[PDB]
């Protein structure tokens, strides 16, 4: 668990995708909660933070270089047996309660030129998102506005300084993809994120109200199928559950059909469900005991 330098090691979060070795059944990501419910559900479930522990004969190398795109060489390395817990366990579009970037807003991808790969954004200034039982999440418009301005600025830096950066709503065949879908404990929020992703930046005139209110549907997990990976839901007729997180980053995919050579279009969400996991796993690499 200790850390020392003077030994360089090569990393590549792409070739060594380590969520690719975290494929255990859904019924083991949840344990039955014994929380004295003393209105109540018969059985309740709690999520266990997502993490990876190195099996015997193997160790996990952790790159401690703060600003690190995930690939290339790494000087400051350390040895651990487990990666750091990821919470929340699902998060489709926004990334909450993650680690903030040092001084700079950082974006990364396995291949920026390949629109198939997810773009993972890491902010340096957290944006609060307060959600309630009444079925809505709130985000300060001024703070989100500045966030997009900083993100669009980095995206330009990656795709060319004279590119107009356009944010559009998700496109997909399920609410888990289309909405910002995340869990705060055993309560799952499906939030309409159209309002967060409906702007264009730096076209010809770019150099609403007080708060952005996202409508959200809330479901409570009450069971699941183990060999199928299917969750089972019920309305939270339990009452009003509150949840406040920090937006610390986000997932984007870039459009491949865009006929405008002067713009790039980005939509919220990744190309894979476990992309939220990947946003937190770029500094690790599994190796054999030396």
């Amino acid at each position, epitope marked *: 668990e200790v850390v020392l330098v003077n030994v360089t090691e090569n990393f590549n979060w792409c070739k060594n995708d380590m969520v690719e070795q975290m494929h255990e059944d859904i019924c083991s990501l949840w344990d039955q909660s014994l929380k004295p419910c003393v209105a109540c559900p018969k059985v309740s479930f709690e999520p266990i933070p997502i993490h990876y522990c190195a099996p015997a004969g193997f160790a996990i190398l952790k790159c401690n270089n703060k600003t690190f795109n995930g690939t290339g060489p790494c000087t400051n390395v350390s040895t651990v047996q487990c990666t750091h817990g990821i919470r929340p366990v699902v998060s489709s579009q926004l990334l909450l309660n993650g680690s903030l970037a040092e001084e700079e807003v950082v974006i990364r991808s396995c291949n920026f030129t390949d629109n198939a790969k997810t773009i993972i954004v890491q902010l340096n200034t957290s944006v609060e998102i307060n959600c309630t039982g009444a079925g809505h999440c709130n985000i300060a418009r001024a703070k989100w506005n500045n966030t997009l301005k900083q993100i669009a600025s980095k995206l330009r830096e990656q795709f060319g300084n004279n590119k107009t950066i356009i944010f559009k709503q998700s496109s*997909g065949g399920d*609410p*888990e993809i*289309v909405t910002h879908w995340f869990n705060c404990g055993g309560e799952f929020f499906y939030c309409n994120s159209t309002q967060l992703f409906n702007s264009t930046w730096f076209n010809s005139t770019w150099s609403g109200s007080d708060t952005i209110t996202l409508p959200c549907r809330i479901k409570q997990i009450i069971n699941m199928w183990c060999k199928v*990976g299917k969750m089972m839901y019920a309305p939270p007729i339990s009452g009003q559950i509150r949840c406040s997180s920090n937006i610390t980053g986000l997932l984007l995919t870039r459009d491949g059909g865009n006929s405008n050579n002067e713009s790039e279009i980005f939509r919220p969400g990744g*190309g*894979d*469900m476990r992309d939220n996991w990947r946003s937190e796993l770029y500094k690790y690499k599994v190796v054999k005991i030396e």
Partner: antibody
Amino acid sequence: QVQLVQSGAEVKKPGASVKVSCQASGYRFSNFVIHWVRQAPGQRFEWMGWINPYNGNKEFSAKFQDRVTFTADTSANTAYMELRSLRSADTAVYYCARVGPYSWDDSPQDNYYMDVWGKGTTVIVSS
Amino acid sequence: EIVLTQSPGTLSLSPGERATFSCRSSHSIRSRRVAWYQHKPGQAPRLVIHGVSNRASGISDRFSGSGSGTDFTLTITRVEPEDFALYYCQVYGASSYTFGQGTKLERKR
């Protein structure tokens, strides 16, 4: 334009297996469920199952669950259907089809109709 | 399990005439998840109607779907030569996927 391109016609012996591919273009492949449906000579269309490229989740028709495997390669924008223990009655045109777009106002699976179809691939099972 | 039965088996009409396709379900379709497909020989089937009454993209406004519960209808105000084809109804979603046996829209002479 949204398009599904399927692999060429196939001739198989009974007891063998066949793998049919379905390649997408014009949209984000991983973001839409894909259905597999067949129609044998003189028969109705039969739904075999679906796969979700985004999470690997699948669903099977009880008629085919034991003999069929759905798979996806997002890096290749391709979904695959493999049917094993083939029999002469499995002789059919096999179609992939994408679900329609989901919207906030929909209930889950309101969009699970067959929005865009491939042209199909003929599978012949015969000795 | 849900059985869909279409009528008539064959619809013989001239261009300009109204067409009415019937789909009858053994089960009341509360979800309103009924679709209609057009299929021409050697061509990919095409979505015409979804959600009982929603015209699919690119579909002529001569097409419309209606009905409820057990009885569903596809109608074409005035048939055009390109409408000649097979038409299938189907139920979809919630593990219930099933198709009618089809109705042939052929040209009268």
